[PDB]
Every structure is written in structure tokens, then in C-alpha cells.
């Protein structure tokens, strides 16, 4: 089950920009063959279909079960265009 969070970020030029935080969990094993291969190739898909408002700093934090790692995803998002 996905958990909704949100957060406040400072910008380069000293301004606050609103954001969110999506937190999804795999829990359960046997996603696919190599989760290093697949869940990397999965999050390049599921992030790009997450454009959901106009003033939202992006939010992807992928959490595989507590088995060594949690993968973050953020980009350089600016007042011109999202990166």
C-alpha cells in the first residue's frame, strides 16, 4: 500500500517550492528476474506517468522490502521546466 507524504524544499535562489512524497512498498518477493534490472526499468516508467499538477515538486521514493536498499528518485526541477 502506497503512502502519501509531502515536503518543503529550498531552492537555489532562496525560495520555497511545494512538493509531495510517494512511498510505495513491494513487500513480497519474486517481482521478476533481476530487481536491479526490473525495478530500475520500472521506475523510469512509473515516474513519467506521475505529472499531476502545476506546482508540485516530484516525489518518487521506491522502497523494496528491508533487504538492503531503498531507491530515491528526484531531478533538478526549476522555475522554467521540470528536468
Amino acid at each position: 500500500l502506497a503512502v502519501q507524504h509531502h515536503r518543503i524544499q529550498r531552492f537555489e535562489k532562496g525560495f520555497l517550492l511545494r512538493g509531495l512524497d510517494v512511498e510505495v512498498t513491494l513487500d513480497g518477493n519474486g517481482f521478476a528476474g533481476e530487481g536491479d534490472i526490473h525495478l530500475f526499468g520500472e521506475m523510469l516508467n512509473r515516474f513519467l506517468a506521475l505529472y499531476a499538477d502545476m506546482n508540485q515538486f516530484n516525489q518518487l521514493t521506491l522502497i523494496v522490502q528491508p533487504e538492503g536498499k531503498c531507491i530515491r528518485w528526484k531531478e533538478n526541477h526549476n522555475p522554467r521546466l521540470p528536468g
Binding site: 529550498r10 537555489e12 535562489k13 532562496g14
Partner: protein, 64 residues
């Protein structure tokens, strides 16, 4: 200029705008609309076209 600064009771850093002076290295025979009032070196060349700092130069001194 904008860099990262932290000293407070805590372990987080953020970004604050600081103040930096503007320097450049002009030559002696150009002008004096800027400031200089201080030499720092003296360049003499070798016969092989090689600038070298001469060992008998003395700046005005605050310390030995």
C-alpha cells in the same frame, strides 16, 4: 555569491548569500583609476623567452 554554510547546534546545512570582494591583476604602467598601491612580484624574462620571478624583489611588508 551563494554557497552552503552550517555552524549551528544541529547537523543540517543550507544555502545563504555571502559577500565577496573583486580582485584582478593589472600592470604598473597601465592606469590608476583602479587602486593598486601594492606590488606583489616582478617578472623578468630569460633569453629563451621565459618569464621568471626575480629573486631580488621585495614587497612592502607586514611580516618577515
Amino acid at each position: 555569491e551563494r554557497v552552503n554554510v552550517q555552524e549551528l547546534a544541529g547537523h543540517e546545512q543550507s544555502e545563504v548569500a555571502v559577500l565577496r570582494h573583486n580582485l584582478t591583476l593589472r600592470m604598473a604602467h597601465q592606469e590608476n583609476a583602479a587602486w593598486l598601491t601594492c606590488p606583489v612580484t616582478r617578472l623578468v624574462r630569460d633569453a629563451q623567452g621565459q618569464w621568471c620571478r626575480d629573486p631580488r624583489f621585495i614587497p612592502p611588508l607586514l611580516t618577515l
